[PDB]
Structures are given as structure tokens and as C-alpha cells.
Amino acid sequence: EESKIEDVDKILNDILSISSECIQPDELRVKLLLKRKLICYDGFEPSGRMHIAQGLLKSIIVNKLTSNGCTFIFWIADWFAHLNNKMSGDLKKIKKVGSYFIEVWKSCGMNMENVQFLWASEEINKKPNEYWSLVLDISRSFNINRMKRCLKIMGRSEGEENYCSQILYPCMQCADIFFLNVDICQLGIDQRKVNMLAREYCDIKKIKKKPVILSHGMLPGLLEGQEKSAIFMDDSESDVNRKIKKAYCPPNVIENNPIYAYAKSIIFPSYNEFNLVRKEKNGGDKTYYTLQELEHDYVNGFIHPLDLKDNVAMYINKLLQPVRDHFQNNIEAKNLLNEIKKYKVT
Amino acid sequence: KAQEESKIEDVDKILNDILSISSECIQPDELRVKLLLKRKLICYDGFEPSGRMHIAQGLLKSIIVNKLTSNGCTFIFWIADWFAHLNNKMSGDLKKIKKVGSYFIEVWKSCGMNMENVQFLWASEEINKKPNEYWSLVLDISRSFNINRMKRCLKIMGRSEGEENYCSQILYPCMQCADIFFLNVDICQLGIDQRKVNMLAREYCDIKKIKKKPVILSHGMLPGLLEGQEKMSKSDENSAIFMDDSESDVNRKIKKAYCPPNVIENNPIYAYAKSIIFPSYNEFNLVRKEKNGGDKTYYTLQELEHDYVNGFIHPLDLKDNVAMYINKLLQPVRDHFQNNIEAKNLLNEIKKYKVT
Ligand SMILES: Nc1ncnc2c1c(OC(F)F)nn2[C@@H]1O[C@H](COS(=O)(=O)NC(=O)[C@@H](N)Cc2ccc(O)cc2)[C@@H](O)[C@H]1O
Ligand SMILES: Nc1ncnc2c1c(OC(F)F)nn2[C@@H]1O[C@H](COS(=O)(=O)NC(=O)[C@@H](N)Cc2ccc(O)cc2)[C@@H](O)[C@H]1O
Ligand SMILES: [Cl-]
Ligand SMILES: [Cl-]
Ligand SMILES: [Mg+2]
Ligand SMILES: [Mg+2]
């Protein structure tokens, strides 16, 4: 039993280090000690070009989970994007974007057996009685104001026009968790309200198989007053360099620093190091083997923001290269990327 | 002319008697245009299976359906089983709800309706046959209206703002609104308490620039037996005559019913004579002992209204005749549930449920 318990403890510690919040790691240990494959999932509204957090950052946690034997589902939330007034509600364009998402994921670390690309409308229509019965029962269990606390999962707020779709959307997202038999909800922190709703629903219905909530931190925006104007998976080297140099990067400050966050959350996990290239008069080249020294050097002003930007832009361009090469060589992926670049984001 | 004059003449007489069994028709101009089609018009009413059926949903409904089906319409009975589940009927138990729905169909099949142009559709069954079409409608309707506009439809569920409002009370009117388009309904023929969601569907047509808008042909609410009961309902105790009540129960309920002398306002006994008995028989034959003035036949409603308001018809005489005619109209239903052994046990089974 020793070797069986040793690895699970170090698995949990590596998971909790790359995850911002885990609702009860004690339950996660119970599921990690199961003689089966766990079901993890994340969901995505095909609303346009893919954010760097949904591709490069996503591959880091996904490969950590799948390499231990877990299955990770990519929930292509096409009906949710239509419900959330994305892509002018055109479901035809949404499915085009969804196909572009699969091509990006397959070229940035998710061309794997333990990854599944599931379309929301396709899977719901296969078992509609089961899915919609879930949605109905969930709506019967919570009041309006409790459901309006989940408005953040759509990028909305209670200060604007609150449409009935904003009540229906979280009922369906809560239903997906049971419909997909999810063990671990691996979504961003901005999704935790509806994730806490599914656990609350289990207590109401006396369901003992409660999903574990494993939230990953939100990558801040490139500009100043931003916490969630961004790097896209299709940006060329010229675009990444232009966006990084104009980005917000306050000296000695780590919070809401999108440049440091890219180095801490994407670059460092992907390389197990951070090679900072500088001129000698600015401190010279230095190889960082721990985030503790990187944080210390930036807070104390050892790393100037200009030097951090140039290295972050260089690393991001290295990580985006297999994506660029897939879209420049796979002609069917190129035409798919060229077509979705013609859409108005709503 | 020849055929043009005769054709336009029968359309206006079909329009005139349809509006007679109607409390409010949202745009009669639209209804006359609908009748100008050689195809059958699709009308529908929906029912939550939530226990015993009372006469407003059985006797009163058969009169309206017979008038529509004999005038070139097809009528759909929409068994709203999932809606009853969504509204916490029969303790939400979907198995009990489906048995009540089967009991409803047994009553309607023995109410004396022309079954050739009548269909019974289960919501859950039809939705699951075309779930992509149906739920796409629900989703698009939810995108079109805000929560405050949707909460104006709470009365279609018998709900109020003063109580805790669950999300089911937002999804319910979105689904009922979608039913109208899912069934390709030309005429929403429901009670007037349903008009808010019927107005929502017409507003949805204007949002989506849909030119085929449904006609709202609402019927009045049959009042309850006691004074002040504006609507007969099983949620209001002692207010209803049920389709399974015996002659003794009907007589006993009507004798204690509210029937103020010389006034028809808020008079439920007079309402049963007007909305149920008179349209069924096309006359009201008031039977009386010679001690009390002998029999008298009323061929129009005003003749009946005039004799009652001025005191020529005593309340007891009106109550005795209303009880007798209702007992006669319920007789084919009683015959079915006493001769059809399978229907009798079905009635016995649903009466063992607890109403919620
Ligand atoms: N800057 C950032 N940093 C770190 N993580 C980030 C972002 C970011 O930026 C953004 F604003 F564009 N998204 N995410 C994360 O990526 C994923 C998809 O995002 S989404 O398209 O918006 N879908 C939704 O929100 C969900 N309602 C869709 C959904 C629907 C049904 C389900 O059963 C499950 C999910 C979710 O996990 C998000 O948390
Ligand atoms: N006393 C009375 N006099 C005259 N008409 C009366 C009543 C009465 O009494 C009551 F309180 F018990 N109901 N009705 C009328 O009968 C019908 C069913 O009634 S219900 O079971 O409550 N279904 C609902 O309310 C609807 N949400 C169900 C529904 C769901 C989806 C649809 O696509 C369409 C409909 C509707 O037409 C009602 O208006
Ligand atoms: Cl199913
Ligand atoms: Cl379909
Ligand atoms: Mg795969
Ligand atoms: Mg038939």
C-alpha cells in the first residue's frame, strides 16, 4: 500500500500547486484512490479566436491530469455560445469556431487518446430526455436570486438587462456536470458559482457522488484595468511582440501583472525553468530554476519590465510555433482559420 | 357574385358564433383571415395532470371543441405532464402525473366530443420526438425576454410574486410559449388566465419578424361554487364540481352554492347556466312544479337574464335546473366509468393520490 499512497499524495500536491482552489482536497484523494479513470472536463463557448489561457495554459493542467490515467473532456459549448449572444447567435459560425478550437488543441498538446472533444448540442440531442430532465429538476431546486449569483460564468452582471437566458444558461451548465458524469470540474475561478451549485444540488437530492471543483487561476488581461487586450492562439510573432511590449507590467508588482502571470503560469511550467536573456549592464543572462527566485528578483527590481517582456514574448512565440506550423501546413486547417477570421465578435 | 357572396357570408357567421363561446379574442380580424384558408386551423389547449378533473376542463371544454371542430378546425389536447412536474404537481411524481393524464383522456373520450378532428398529445413524448427543434425554440425565447417580463406570466402556473420564485417559474413560461410554435398552432384556445404567455408568443413573433402570429381565443373562467371564488379550482376547497361526482354530490354542492336573488353579477349558478347548459342545449328549459309557476323554455340568454334579475325565476328553481342539466351532461362520463372496468380502476387509482 505504501507505493500506492505515496504517489497519490505527491499527485495531489502537484495538482494543488498549479490549481488556485480545490473544493475539499480530501474528496479528491478519495477519487484519486479509485480503481478507475476519473472524468475531468472543461467547457468552452466558441465565441471567436481562442485566448492563450484556453490553449497554452489549458494544456499544462490537462497533461498533468491525463498522464495519471484520467480522461479529460473538452465540452464544446456551442448551444451555450448561442444562448450567450456570441457570434451574433449564428450557430453555423459557432460550429466553425468549435472546429477551429479542436485544431488548435490537437496542435498544442491535446492530440491524445485520453482527451475527448464533445459537442454540447450533439451529446444533448443523443439523450434529450435524460439531459432536459436534469435541467428541469435543477430549476425546481433553486430560486431566481440564487441562480443570478452565477452571472459571472457568462461574463454578465446583475447591473444590466437580465434576460431569461441568464437563468437558463447556469441550469444547463450545472446539468452538464451530472450528464457527463464528471468527477473533477476543471474550469476557471470565474466558473465556481455554478460549480458550487452542483455540489449544493447533490446535498438537496441526497447524491453522494459529488464532483470535485478544481479551479485554475484567471490570467489577467494585457491592459491595466483588466483581471481576466489579450494573446490569441493564432497571433503571429509580430502580433505577440507588439502586444507584449504594449502590455501592462508594473515594476516590483506581481498582482494583476499579465506579463509575470504568463511567465509564472505558462512559461515556467512548460520548461521547468525560465531563461532570462539580458545584456550584461542590465544583469546579464540568468537561468531561474524556481519561481521563488523569479518572484524575488522581480519584486526587488532586479528584473526590469522591459527585460521580462522580451523574454516572455520570445517564449510565447516558441510555444505557439507548433500551432502556427499546423495551420500553415494543414490546408484544411488553414481554410478553417481564414474563414473564422471574417466574423464579428458579439 | 353567386359563390362570392355566399362564401363571405358563412365566414362571418362562423366568426360570429366562435366569438360567442369566447371571452376575449386578440384581433378578430386575424381570426377571419385564418378562416379564409381551405386547410384546417390548428387549435390547442394544455392541461397539467394534477388530480381530479372538474367541469371547467371537461364539460365546458367539450362545448368549445365541438364548436371549433364542426367549423373546420383541428383541436389538440396537450397533456402537459412535464409542466405539472415542473409546477410540483402530484408531489412532482411523474408516474402519478402520467396516470392522471390517462384519466383525463378517458374523461374527454366520453364527454361527447367529435373525435375525428381531436388529438391527444403528451408533452414529454412529442418533445422527445423532435428535441432539437423544441429546445432550440425554448433557448431562443429565453434570449428574447428579460426576467421581469417573464415573471408577469406567473399566473399561468397559479403562482404569485409574494412567494419564493424558483427558476422553474422562468422555464415553465418559456416552454409553454415554445409549445405554440412547436405545434404550429393557429389558435391558442385556453382560459383567460393564460393570456400573459399567449401575449408573449405574439410579442415573440414581432421580435423575430414572424408574419404568422397565433390568434388568442380565450374563454372565461368558470367561477367556483361559493361567493367570491372567481375561478373553479381544486386548490380552492369546496369550489368545484368534478367529472366523477355523483348525482347526490352535484345536487348537494349546487344547493349550498352561491346564487343571490335578482342579480347575475358574480353568480356562479347563473354562470353554469350561461357558459355550460345553454350552449349544450341551445335553450334553457326551466322545469318547475305548478306550485312554483310550471315549466318555461328560454330560447335566448337575454330572456333568461331578464326573468332572473326581475325576480320571475327564484334562485332555488335556477339551482334545481342547473343541477339537473349538469347531472345529465355528466351521465355519459358516469356510464363510461361504470361500464369500462379498465377506466373504473383507473379512476379509483388516481383518487388515492395526494393533491399538491
Ligand atoms: N483570461 C482567462 N484566464 C484563465 N482562464 C480563462 C480565461 C478566459 O477568458 C475568457 F474571458 F475569454 N476563460 N478562461 C476559462 O476558459 C474556459 C472557457 O471560457 S468561456 O468561453 O468563456 N466558457 C464559459 O465561461 C462557460 N460558461 C462555458 C461552459 C458551458 C457548459 C459547461 O458544462 C461548462 C462550461 C472556462 O473554464 C474559463 O473559466
Ligand atoms: N375554473 C376554470 N374555468 C375555465 N377555464 C379554466 C378553469 C381552470 O381552473 C384551474 F385553476 F384549475 N383552468 N381553466 C383552463 O383550463 C386549462 C388547463 O388548466 S391547468 O391545468 O391549470 N394548465 C395551465 O395552467 C397551463 N400552464 C398548462 C399548459 C402548458 C403548456 C402549454 O403549451 C399550454 C398549457 C387552461 O387553458 C386553463 O386556462
Ligand atoms: Cl434519453
Ligand atoms: Cl429535432
Ligand atoms: Mg483524443
Ligand atoms: Mg382523433
Numbering used by the authors:
A (entry chain A): 20 to 247, 255 to 372
B (entry chain B): 17 to 372
Task: Pull text from the paper.
We identified adenosine 5′-sulfamate (AMS) as a broad specificity compound that hijacks a range of aaRSs; and ML901 as a specific reagent that hijacks a single aaRSs in the malaria parasite, Plasmodium falciparum, namely, tyrosine RS (PfYRS). The target enzyme catalyzes the formation of an inhibitory amino acid-sulfamate conjugate, via a reaction-hijacking mechanism. To confirm that recombinant PfYRS can generate the ML901-Tyr conjugate, we incubated PfYRS with substrates and ML901, then precipitated the tRNA and protein. To obtain crystals of ML901-Tyr-bound PfYRS, we incubated His-tagged PfYRS with tyrosine, ATP and ML901 in the presence of tRNA and then purified the complex using nickel affinity and gel filtration chromatography. In combination, these observations indicate different conformations of the KMSKS loop in individual monomers within the dimer. Potency and selectivity of ML901 for PfYRS thus appears to be associated with a stabilized loop over the active site.
